[PDB]
Amino acid sequence: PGPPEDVTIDEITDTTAQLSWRPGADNHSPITMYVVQARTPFSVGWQAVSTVPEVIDGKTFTATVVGLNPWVEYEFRVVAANLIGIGEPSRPSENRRTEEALPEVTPANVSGGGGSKSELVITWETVPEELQNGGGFGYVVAFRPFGTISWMQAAVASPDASRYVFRNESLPPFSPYEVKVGVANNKGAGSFSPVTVVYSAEEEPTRAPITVLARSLSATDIEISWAPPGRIQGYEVRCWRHDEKEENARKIRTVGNQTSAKVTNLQGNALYHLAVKAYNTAGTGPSSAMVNVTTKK
């Protein structure tokens, strides 16, 4: 058997396409069967497809291919079969894109967090092109503060996107948000991912430590304590000698709820200046008042 010719896509729908071929070299024994194979940007080589009629005899020359993927560029080719063997494939038809259809798949791994002041960061995994099922693909990000009713939809019109940031100066710091994302193309809208909870961005502490105490333990050691007045991971206390500039100040940081520290490796009979700030991940808050201590001799 030998290659058929003149493969054409007569009509095409969102899931089907009508094909038409003309028979070619059939060696000597008659043609008993025709099969259709398809190729896509996602296919490894040529792939078999379902057809109506379910089987294409040698006397049939048009069929509908069924079960195609919406909004995908398809190539087709037809292979003849003889009682002696399988023929050579025909040359591929011209590439045609299927019609549009609604999107069915929702983005994966919706999460987020972080960002600059007064922001809310939402992330997701981008939906691949084969599953976008239409042009004009985009994402719908719906969010609301935990315990509230009304939603807020933002449309992210880039199909390749995987991130959305909402900024507004009335945003509470490090606050919880219900978040879900969805998909939509030109035909309409898809469904939504499951609801997850994303926390807004965090700001540095707003108040400064109070009632700073400081006493010299030895010629090289100074003890310093304070009281706490939003989240606080610890405290940064800085310390610089009188003759040195504040820019270069020895800084050491508290981790935990402890409200004191010891500054060591100092010079004997020297005046030092110390103050302590609160800090979170966002940065250092305001500085407490300054205290002045001279080490022992």
Author numbering: 598 to 826, 833 to 900
Give the published text.
Contactins (CNTNs) are neural cell adhesion molecules that encode axon-target specificity during the patterning of the vertebrate visual and olfactory systems. Because CNTNs are tethered to the plasma membrane by a glycosylphosphatidylinositol anchor, they lack an intracellular region to communicate across the membrane. Finally, structural analyses of five CNTN–amyloid pairs indicate that these proteins interact through a conserved interface involving the second fibronectin type III repeat of CNTNs and the copper-binding domain of amyloid proteins.
We designed three variants of chicken CNTN4 by changing interface residues to alanine to validate our structural results. Residues T751/V752 or Y781/E786 were substituted with alanine in the first two mutants, whereas all four residues were mutated to alanine in the third. Residues Y781 and E786 interact with H137 in APP, and changing these two residues to alanine led to a 20-fold weaker binding (KD = 115 μM versus 5.4 μM). Importantly, this difference in binding affinity is not because of any gross structural change brought about by the introduction of alanine residues as evidenced by comparing the structure of chicken CNTN4 with a mutant that includes all four alanine mutations.
